[PDB]
Amino acid sequence: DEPKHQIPGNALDNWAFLRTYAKPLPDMIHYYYYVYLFGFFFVYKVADFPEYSPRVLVMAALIGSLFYVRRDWVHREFKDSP
Amino acid sequence: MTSRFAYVTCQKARNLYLEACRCLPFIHRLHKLEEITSLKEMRLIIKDKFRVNSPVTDS
Amino acid sequence: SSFLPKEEVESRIIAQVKEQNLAAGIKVELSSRFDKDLGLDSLDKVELLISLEEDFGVEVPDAEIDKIHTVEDAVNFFISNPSS
Amino acid sequence: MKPLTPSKVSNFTINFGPQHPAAHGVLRLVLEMDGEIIKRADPHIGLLHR
Amino acid sequence: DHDHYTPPKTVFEDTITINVLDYDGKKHAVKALIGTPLNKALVEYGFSSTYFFPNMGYYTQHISDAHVFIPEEYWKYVENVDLKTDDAEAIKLMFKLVVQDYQRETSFFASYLTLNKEMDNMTIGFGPIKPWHITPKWSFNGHHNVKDRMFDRLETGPFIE
Amino acid sequence: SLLKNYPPSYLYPFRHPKPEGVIEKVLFNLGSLFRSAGQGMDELGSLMLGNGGMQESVGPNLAYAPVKYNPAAAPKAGIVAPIPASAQRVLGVKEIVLPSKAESTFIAPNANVLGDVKIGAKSSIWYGAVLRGDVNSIEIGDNTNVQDNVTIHVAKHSIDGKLRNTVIGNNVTIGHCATIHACTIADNVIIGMGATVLDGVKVESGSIVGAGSIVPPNTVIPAGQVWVGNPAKFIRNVLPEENGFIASSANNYDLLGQQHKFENSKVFEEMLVEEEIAKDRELLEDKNLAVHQLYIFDPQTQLAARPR
Amino acid sequence: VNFYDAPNGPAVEQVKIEDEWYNRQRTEFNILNKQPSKADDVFIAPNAVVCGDVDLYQKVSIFFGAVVRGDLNTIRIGENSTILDKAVVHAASTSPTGLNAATIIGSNVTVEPHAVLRSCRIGDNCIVGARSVVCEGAIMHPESVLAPGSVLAPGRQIPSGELWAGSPAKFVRKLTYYETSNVIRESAEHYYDIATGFRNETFDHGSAWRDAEAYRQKLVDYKEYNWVNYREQKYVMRLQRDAAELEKLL
Ligand SMILES: CCCCCCCCCCCCCCCCCC(=O)OC[C@H](COP(=O)([O-])OCC(O)COP(=O)([O-])OC[C@@H](COC(=O)CCCCCCCCCCCCCCCCC)OC(=O)CCCCCCCCCCCCCCCCC)OC(=O)CCCCCCCCCCCCCCCCC
Ligand SMILES: CCCCCCCCCCCC(=O)SCCNC(=O)CCNC(=O)[C@H](O)C(C)(C)COP(=O)(O)O
Incomplete structure (x- = not known):
């Protein structure tokens, strides 16, 4: 026997939390199609954007990073409900 | 390959x-x-x- | 080994057992041999197993049909089996 | 440790009914065909058993 | 000092049998040793390579897992996992990519269950799995029609094919 | 087969036919020059290599090998054969005893079977087994398996008249690395792996001698008993099912011997052709190849069988 | 006699052992559908015989006289495991225990001369002594040693970290930490060095083929050498066998 890390939580509760990731998985082409199209149009529009201060650009990048939701997070938490 | 521990139709109609x-x-x-x-x-x-053929008994 | 509650599966099997003409009247419960208590015929036993096939979506082996004898035995068979 | 090789399956159990440019009479012919090639032919007779 | 030595039990005493329901619906009696993980015992029996998928962890893909259905009475012996670690990440990807809708409350992975004496004559079943891909060599089209054995696969795990 | 235009190199990989084109003839002569120069360089290297020079030669076939014939002691199990006249004017031996085996018998090329050895049909002598009948005869019955690295030995009867021949009965299994000196074994006996059976030992039918057990000399193991230990002692009687195992082991090793005899008996040219069969089987595993669209190949020999 | 469903085909020409004038034993050869697999650094001695479904991992050494027969079931030898002289490793079709009957040998396992292993599980860093018999279904757990002249009866177990001896093998002493950590691995490394040496002075095609080539060349010069299309003959033999099997009435 060896000293081991204590695992917080009950075994069955943690397994139940992990089982909430087993949901119908959409194929990634649907996201990719829209991202490609809107990205092409976006790159066309960017050349017309006004020149922004570097400070504002960095703050916008920080806000976007904070606001970005990982695709797995929506996967676990999605409910087909109002 | 051996140990002492090693080794220790009347209803044909039902099947049909x-x-x-x-x-x-x-x-x-x-x-x-x-x-x-x-x-x-x-x-x-x-x-x-x-059930119509119940009386028969010959195999 | 009971995958689903014993009370539920028993109520369901006895519900299907009641559907057969006899196997009712004063004694429709556990510990009732199909052919020695309920008056069922062998073909009727096989059909009853097929009706349980429809109810619980799981098949029964024919050799198991040779092994099954009682209302307890059928519910035990269906509770044991993971597909249930 | 040498791989086994699988095979193909035949379907298309056609029914070739009474058909005029053929030998005269009524022929019912059940043909099992792998694609456009026949694998079994089972002639059904008794249509003129008097 | 010098307490009594305990002679080991022979293989016959410490072999437990488990009844495993396979994908075709046949029940197999899988003799297994106490102290072995369920995945290893299932692999040694001679189940096909489609029945198993690698553990989708950063450093656990050499292990071969299976989607299994465990009766409520034996849920206690399943191993707890820390969500804030990457073992939970392996588990979450295995649900996300392999099990998906075929999940049930009895769904578990074999590596996290260890066989013991009290698990004798336990009835488990292989759980349905969706088509999955890691590498073209290590993938599942969805057809359970190869007759090989996961035992006969010397390849340790997925890398560049 | 479907096609008859296959290249001659493809049909005869072991030895290409005589060169017919000018280029082929020039290549043949250049190969001759290369062969001679390579042998010269080989000998020059062997000089530096020292005593022996790492020389290699073909080894004699000792699976069917003779022993000196004794006019006093006539052969008992094996046959006696004359030797070539030139060897007569060199060696001076008139006749030599040779082993006697049935056609179904499998003897491994590694095994050394010498002289007074009679082996029955469906019996197998496996790899590394040494069977020496130089001084006295060895008899092996049908469906008897002498496994890997087994040594069977005999001695002279001597003044007492004690029989020092080795008689092995039918359906007898001798486990790997077992040593059997001049003993008698009855039918349907398993000798365990590593077991030593010394002089004078009679093992009765239906008995099992355990693995790594030395049965003392002049000891009779009675029928249907299991004996194990360094001074081999009785432990239990053979179970009724264990008898069926004894027979099953004999039969399984008969089938095994048939397979191994089939593999070993192929000639070189056939072996090399089969190596090419395996190789182009591996190359033809890809089913998107252009040639696969052209033809369907026979599985056992990857030759074009029918067009696709 | 002739296996007509063999993977590479039936044998057109089979030669009897009496007719052999030289030893043709192959150190690695194929038994029907079972093919031995070897790594680049695996040493098989010229005397050694390896047949059947035997998988040789990297740094596996098979020394002189050792026979590893993988005919009945699979044999796996782990990394840096050495089979020493005249040691037989074989696999049973089934095991008495009811587990898998394959003969699995772990890493850094030394099987000492004349030791017989049949359908056993040998754990990593184990030593089987000289003339030690491990029977079917016997399992040696890792870091365990079986002393010379000892028998592990079918379905028996040797626990980890223990030295076992005797014909009915029994516990003798617990192996020390230094032993299990170093010496057991070091023995396998030493025999790997010896086998590496033997490999370094081995030529790819040693000059023993010249003697048979001389006979073949003599036959060619005297015009007795015959060119046989073995592929076509195999195809024809299989066709004839199928036709005869269709014709037979019983
Ligand atoms: C209707 C269609 C739906 C889409 C709508 C939009 C359609 C597109 C229109 C136009 C698209 C072009 C522009 C979009 C952005 C370009 C990205 C892209 O297209 O790639 C394809 C991408 C899909 O590609 P994929 O290969 O399938 O996914 C890869 C991932 O693994 C995906 O897997 P994952 O999601 O599971 O994993 C995500 C992972 C992926 O990693 C990333 O997201 C990388 C992003 C890093 C920044 C990217 C570079 C930023 C430079 C911006 C340049 C402009 C400013 C210039 C100056 C800035 C100087 C930096 O990141 C994370 O784990 C979560 C954190 C996210 C940011 C991480 C950085 C955190 C820093 C904050 C520190 C604070 C913490 C302190 C406390 C910590 C405590 C210890 O599609 C998109 O994601 C587009 C979604 C649009 C939402 C973006 C929201 C803001 C956008 C502008 C802000 C820029 C910051 C970027 C935020 C994250 C963007 C991904
Ligand atoms: C739409 C498609 C419908 C198909 C219709 C097919 C109808 C087939 C009808 C053929 C009838 C038979 O075979 S009749 C088979 C021969 N008849 C006999 O009586 C032999 C022994 N009979 C008995 O034991 C009992 O009568 C019995 C009640 C059968 C108990 O069955 P079990 O032996 O198990 O106990």
């Missing part, structure tokens, strides 16, 4: 009836009989068809 019951859904779909009749309903007729 089981075959008929298991094959019933297939003939329902093949003969388009879903709407007209139910599987249980046909399963009931098959028994009467079997």
Whole structure:
């Protein structure tokens, strides 16, 4: 026997939390199609954007990073409900 | 390869009836009989068809 | 080994057992041999197993049909089996 | 440790009914065909058993 | 000092049998040793390579897992996992990519269950799995029709094919 | 087969036919020059290599090998054969005893079977087994398996008249690395792996001698008993099912011997052709190849069988 | 006699052992559908015989006289495991225990001369002594040693970290930490060095083929050498066998 890390939580509760990731998985082409199209149009529009201060650009990048939701997070938490 | 621990049809009609019951859904779909009749309903007729020949005893 | 509650599966099997003409009247419960208590015939036993096939979406082996004898035995068979 | 090799399956259990440019009479012919090639032919007779 | 030595039990005493329901619906009696993980015992029996998928962890893909259905009475012996670690990440990807809708409350992975004496004559079943891909060599089209054995696969795990 | 235009190199990989084109003839002569120069360089290297020079030669076939014939002691199990006249004017031996085996018998090329050895049909002598009948005869019955690295030995009867021949009965299994000196074994006996059976030992039918057990000399193991231990002692009687195992082991090793005899008996040219069969089987595993669209190949021999 | 469903085909020409004038034993050869697999650094001695479904991992050494027969079931030898002289490793079709009957040998396992292993699980860093018999279904757990002249009966177990001896093998002493950590691995490394040496002075095609080539060349010069299309003959033999099997009435 060896000293081991204590695992917080009950075994069955943690397994139940992990089982909430087993949901119908959409194929990634649907996201990719829209991202490609809107990205092409976006790159066309960017050349017309006004020149922004570097400070504002960095703050916008920080806000976007904070606001970005990982695709797995929506996967676990999605409910087909109002 | 050995240890002492190592080593330690009267109902033919029943089998035929089981075959008929298991094959019933297939003939329902093949003969388009879903709407007209139910599987249980046909399963009931098959028994009467079997029961007509009960008296015989020769193998 | 009971995958689903014993009370539920028992109530369901006895519900299907009641559907057969006899196997009722004063004694429709556990510990009732199909052919020695309920008056059922062997073909009727096989059909009853097929009706349980429809109720619980799981097949029964024919050798198991040779092994099954009682209302307890059928519910035990269906509770044991993971597909249930 | 040498791989096994699988095979193909035949379907298309056609029914070739009474057909005029053929030998005269009524022929019911059940043909099992792998694609456009026949694998079994089972002639159904008794349609003119008097 | 010098307490009594305990002679080991022979293989016959410490072999437990488990009844495993395979994908075709046949029940197999899998003799297994106490102290072995369920995945290893299932692999040694001779189940096909389609029945198993690698553990989708950063450093656990050499292990071969299976989607199994465990009766409520034996849920206690399943191993707890820390969500804030990457073992939970392996588990979450295995649900996300392999099990998906075929999940049930009895769904578990074999590596996290260890066989013991009290698990004798336990009935487990192989759980349905969706088509999955890691590498073209290590993938599942969805057809359970190869007759090989996961035992006969010397390849340790997925890397560049 | 479907096609008859296959290249001659493809049809005869072991030895290409005589060169017919000018280019082929020039290549043949250049190969001759290369062969001679390579042998010269080989000998020059062997000089530096020292005593022996790492020389290699073909080894004699000792699976069917003779022993000196004794006019006093006539052969008992094996046959006696004359030797070539030139060897007569060199060696001076008139006749030599040779082993006697049935056609179904499998003897491994590694095994050394010498002289007075009679082996029955469906019996197998496996790899590394040494069977010496130089001084006295060895008899092996049908469906008897002498496994890997087994040594069977005999001695002279001597003044007492004690029989020092080795008689092995039918359906007898001798486990790997077992040593059997001049003993008698009855039918349907398993000798365990590593077991030593010394002089004078009679093992009765239906008995099992355990693995790594030395049965003392002049000891009779009675029928249907299991004996194990360094001074081999009785432990239990053979179970009724264990008898069926004894027979099953004999039969399984008969089938095994048939397979191994089939593999070993192929000639070189056939072996090399089969190596090419395996190789182009591996190359033809890809089913998107252009040639696969052209033809369907026979599985056992990857030759074009029918067009696709 | 002739296996007509063999993977590479039936044998067109089979030669009897009496007719052999030289030893043709192959150190690695194929038994029907079972093919031995070897790594680049695996040493098989010229005397050694390896047949059947035997998988040789990297740094596996098979020394002189050792026979590893993988005919009945699979044999796996782990990394840096050495089979020493005249040691037989074989696999049973089934095991008495009911587990897998394959003969699995772990890493850094030394099987000493004349030791017989049949359908056993040998754990990593184990030593089987000289003339030690491990029977079917016997499992040696890792870091365990079986002393010379000892028998592990079918379905028996040797626990980890223990030295076992005797014909009915029994516990003798617990192996020390230094032993299990170093010496057991070091023995396998030493025999790997010896086998590496033997490999370094081995030529790819040693000059023993010249003697048979001389006979073949003599036959060619005297015009007795015959060119046989073995592929076509195999195809024809299989066709004839199928036709005869269709014709037969019983
Ligand atoms: C209707 C269609 C739906 C889409 C709508 C939009 C359609 C597109 C229109 C136009 C698209 C072009 C522009 C979009 C952005 C370009 C990205 C892209 O297209 O790639 C394809 C991408 C899919 O590609 P994929 O290969 O399938 O996914 C890869 C991932 O693994 C995906 O897997 P994952 O999601 O599971 O994993 C995500 C992972 C992926 O990693 C990333 O997201 C990388 C992003 C890093 C920044 C990217 C570079 C930023 C430079 C911006 C340049 C402009 C400013 C210039 C100056 C800035 C100087 C930096 O990141 C994370 O784990 C979560 C954190 C996210 C940011 C991480 C950085 C955190 C820093 C904050 C520190 C604070 C913490 C302190 C406390 C900590 C405590 C210890 O599609 C998109 O994601 C587009 C979604 C649009 C939402 C973006 C929201 C803001 C956008 C502008 C802000 C820029 C910051 C970027 C935020 C994250 C963007 C991904
Ligand atoms: C739509 C498709 C419907 C198909 C219809 C098919 C109808 C087939 C009808 C053929 C009838 C037979 O075979 S009749 C088979 C021979 N008849 C006999 O009586 C032999 C022994 N009989 C008995 O034991 C009992 O009468 C019995 C009640 C059978 C108990 O069955 P079990 O032996 O198990 O106990």
